[PDB]
Design a protein around this ligand. Structure first.
Ligand SMILES: CSc1ncnc2c1ncn2[C@@H]1O[C@H](CO)[C@@H](O)[C@H]1O
Ligand SMILES: CSc1ncnc2c1ncn2[C@@H]1O[C@H](CO)[C@@H](O)[C@H]1O
Ligand SMILES: [Cl-]
Ligand code: NA
Ligand code: NA
Length: 351
């Protein structure tokens, strides 16, 4: 029963994992290896998936990250989460899976809508995702969320939550803004979030303490907000120099040129390359961090999906333990490394 160390909002989704024939991907016009939102002609994909013996597992980006936090903290209610679900069987299945892990949650029910669902299709060593948000889009942060989250100083939201309404993440970040030890953290989530919610994200970033994102997301952020010269907008982030310039430019979106005692940090994951981060220190000087990623044979990599969510989960767990920025990144790396070496988006039992 607490204490709650991290509170997050997200799109609660039930992942349906199953191996399928290539004719399946072809029949539903899917391209192997891509993650997309279900099209009108793919609405029967979930019911059709049933004939392939699907495994139901809790999903959703933010939910995956807080489950990592909860697993590491162990005490029931160590992490809290809010999102919306439907009034269907699938919603009950998701809620049960979360309760047994000890996560503190409050799922808002949307009558008549279906709980978020993601088809994780395994074919030819690749993962193809097809997501249908459903009820997730109806989520509206309840007025008493601060009471539900009592005690937590670390708040987290994915840019994916902007698809319901950017007001949810703005309200959470607004609560943390100005309070020196209150930390709001955000994930860029996907390239389309950066473009589609340009202005809402710009405002949200001013209220952000820590920003997480991968290379592709940051490249889009840099282009939309003109963080670097047009001549550099296409340079490879696999180049330390360019990655650092992008991170340093993005940091300005959080600092607005001002300096307080509050945390202001941008973290860029770069696949197998070292994680790069730009941090505004106590006196306002900017310091760059480079944390190498432990090598892992390509033969031991099962799937990179979920690595990002696990990384964030680890980072936040470490942060709640008061670890340094480098230590937080290393923990995120350890969690990400565990998840990519086996089926599923959760940490191994033995971890
Ligand atoms: C706004 S679209 C969206 N929002 C939040 N999470 C998403 C979305 N699409 C897929 N997922 C989740 O990504 C997890 C793997 O990273 C998978 O668990 C999958 O459920
Ligand atoms: C050979 S590919 C590879 N090798 C080792 N680790 C990987 C790799 N790809 C991703 N990671 C880990 O996932 C984090 C980003 O989610 C990355 O920051 C990193 O921690
Ligand atoms: Cl999410
Ligand atoms: Na500072
Ligand atoms: Na995995």
């Amino acid at each position: 029963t607490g204490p709650m160390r991290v509170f997050a909002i997200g799109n609660p989704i039930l992942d349906l994992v199953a191996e399928v024939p290539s004719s399946f991907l072809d029949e539903f016009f899917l391209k192997r290896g891509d993650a997309t939102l279900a099209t009108p002609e793919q609405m029967r994909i979930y019911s059709t998936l049933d004939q392939f013996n699907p495994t139901s597992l809790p999903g959703g980006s933010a939910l995956n990250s807080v489950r990592v936090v909860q697993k590491l903290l162990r005490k029931p209610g160590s992490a809290g989460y809010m999102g919306a679900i439907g009034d269907d069987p699938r919603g009950q299945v998701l809620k049960e899976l979360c309760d047994k892990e000890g996560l503190a949650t409050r799922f808002m029910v949307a009558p008549g809508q279906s709980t978020g669902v993601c088809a994780v299709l395994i074919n030819e060593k690749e993962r193809t995702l097809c997501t249908h948000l459903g009820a997730c889009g109806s989520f509206r942060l309840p007025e008493d969320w601060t009471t539900f989250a009592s005690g937590a100083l670390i708040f987290y939201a994915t840019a994916y939550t902007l698809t319901a309404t950017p007001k949810n993440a703005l309200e959470v970040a607004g609560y943390a803004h100005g309070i020196p030890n209150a930390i709001f953290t955000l994930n860029l989530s996907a390239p389309f979030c950066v473009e589609l919610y340009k202005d809402a994200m710009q405002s949200l970033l001013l209220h952000t303490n820590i920003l997480f994102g991968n290379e592709e997301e940051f490249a889009h952020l840099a282009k939309v907000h003109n963080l670097v010269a047009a001549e550099k907008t296409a340079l490879s982030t696999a180049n330390k120099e360019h990655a650092v310039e992008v991170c340093t430019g993005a940091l300005r979106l959080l600092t607005a040129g001002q300096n307080t005692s509050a945390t202001k940090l941008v973290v860029m994951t770069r696949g197998h390359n070292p994680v790069i981060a730009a941090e505004q220190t106590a006196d306002g000087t900017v310091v760059v961090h480079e944390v190498g990623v432990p090598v892992v044979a390509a033969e031991k990599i099962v799937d990179t999906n979920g690595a990002g969510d696990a990384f964030v989960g680890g980072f936040l767990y470490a942060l709640s333990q008061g670890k340094t920025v480098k230590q937080c990144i290393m923990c995120g790396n350890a969690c990400a490394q565990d998840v990519i070496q086996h089926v599923g988006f959760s940490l191994s039992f033995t971890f």
